[PDB]
Structure 1
Amino acid sequence: SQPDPMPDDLHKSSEFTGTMGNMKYLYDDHYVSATKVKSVDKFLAHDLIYNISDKKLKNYDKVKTELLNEDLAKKYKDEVVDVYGSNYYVNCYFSSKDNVWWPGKTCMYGGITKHEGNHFDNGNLQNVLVRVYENKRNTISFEVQTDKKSVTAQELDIKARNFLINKKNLYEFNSSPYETGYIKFIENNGNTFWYDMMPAPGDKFDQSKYLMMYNDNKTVDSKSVKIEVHLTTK
């Protein structure tokens, strides 16, 4: 398992001076979701393109997802899969040139699980408990739900942040009530890993580079996995 964070490993919202609404955006009732799809194209060797239509607005009809490498893309290319992840538009490119708008398209990382045999007997959902710690005190717990036996850390991370934006103002348009935050996952076999929840310091937030951490397409057993969200206040 990955070593837990020391305070110096964690981004601080106090050191970020841009618009925290750009981070909020990525997690606030925001996700690509599709069931039983197969990729239809690609751009580079490490990515897959799906015909998925925006159900909310009409921002896209195609979603490109990038995977860590070409061999991860080959794993899923011809498979019938489900897709769940957080998409972006700024710097969502389908060629080499910077600054190009690609109408009808959106981009994301990872988010792919094989469809067949990954679902529950009926219209049944699996609950995963999230324990939230504020300044080391477990003040709040809740469950997120998934239709999947093997679910990406990304999908659970999203559902957890979405709940917390709505109940605890995790991210707000200008800043956050929190100084640091990380989400740690604890697997059945003792393996743990975590993601920093705050933007890198500075005046700007690159959404694409932030989400790229999902490109490993890390999956967990939704039945046995544990999630802790650890926050400190300003």
Structure 2
Amino acid sequence: SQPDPMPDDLHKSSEFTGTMGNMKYLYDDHYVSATKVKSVDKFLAHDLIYNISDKKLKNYDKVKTELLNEDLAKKYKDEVVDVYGSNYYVNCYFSSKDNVWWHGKTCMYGGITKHEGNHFDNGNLQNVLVRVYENKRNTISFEVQTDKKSVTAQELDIKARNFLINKKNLYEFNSSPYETGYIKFIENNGNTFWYDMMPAPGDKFDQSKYLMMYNDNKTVDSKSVKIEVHLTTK
């Protein structure tokens, strides 16, 4: 497994003079969700463009998701999959120039699974517990719902955070009531892995590069997997 995080091994809110609103941005009721679709193009040896359209607004008609490497790209290159990820724009490219615009386009990483025989019986949804810890105490516990029989940690994580934003101010437009925080997962087998929630100790925040962590498209088994979030107050 991934060993439990360390004190000075965690990012500190107090150290980010930036604007925590660009992080809130990626999880207050913001995700991309497509069902039963197939890649329809591609840029570099490892990203599959789909023709998924913005339902909420009118920002994109296509969605470039980038994966860990080339072979992980093909695993899905022409299969009917579902999608669940956080998209961004500032630095969403399709060529060589680094800050350039397009439209109907948006980027992400990971969030896809083979649709065939992965959903439930008659539309039933699965519930996933979340134990929240504030300063080491099980303060709040809720659950998350999904349609996958095996889903993208990203999906699950987003859904977690979105709630914490909507009910426990995990992120506020200027900063956050918390100093540190990480979302750790436990797999039925004993695999446990965690992901830092706080920005990088400095002035600005590259939205993108944060997310690049979701390019391992790592998946988990809803019906069993359990979640833990861990916070420390300012």
- Normalised by the length of structure 2, the TM-score is 0.99
1:99 aligns with 2:79: no
Q: Deviations over 1:107-155 (max 9, x none)?
A: 0000011100110001110000011000000100000000000100000
d(CA) in 1 for partners of 2:109, 2:126: 24
Q: Deviations over 1:28-75 (max 9, x none)?
A: 100000000000001001111000000000000000000000000000
| Residue 99 (structure 1) shift | 1.2
d(CA) in 1 for partners of 2:102, 2:23: 22
Secondary structure of the structure 2 residue equivalent to 1:143:
strand
| Residue 102 (structure 1) shift | 1.3
d(CA) in 2 for partners of 1:159, 1:88: 17
Q: Deviations over 1:148-170 (max 9, x none)?
A: 00100000000000000011000
1:60 counterpart residue number: 60
Q: How many residues align?
A: 234
2:25 counterpart residue number: 25
Q: Deviations over 1:67-95 (max 9, x none)?
A: 00000000001110000000000000001
d(CA) in 1 for partners of 2:51, 2:8: 42
| Residue 6 (structure 1) shift | 1.0
Identity, % of aligned pairs? 100
d(CA) in 1 for partners of 2:145, 2:161: 13
| Residue 9 (structure 1) shift | 0.9
d(CA) in 2 for partners of 1:216, 1:102: 26
Could you list the runs of 4 or more consecutive aligned residues of structure 1 that deviate by over 6 angstroms after TM superposition? none
Secondary structure of the structure 2 residue equivalent to 1:17:
coil
Instruction: Name stretches of at least 5 consecutive residues in structure 1 with no aligned partner.
Output: none
1:72-87 maps to which residues of 2 (within 5 A)? 72-87=72-87
d(CA) in 1 for partners of 2:102, 2:157: 28
d(CA) in 2 for partners of 1:227, 1:195: 12
d(CA) in 2 for partners of 1:120, 1:43: 34
d(CA) in 2 for partners of 1:188, 1:30: 29
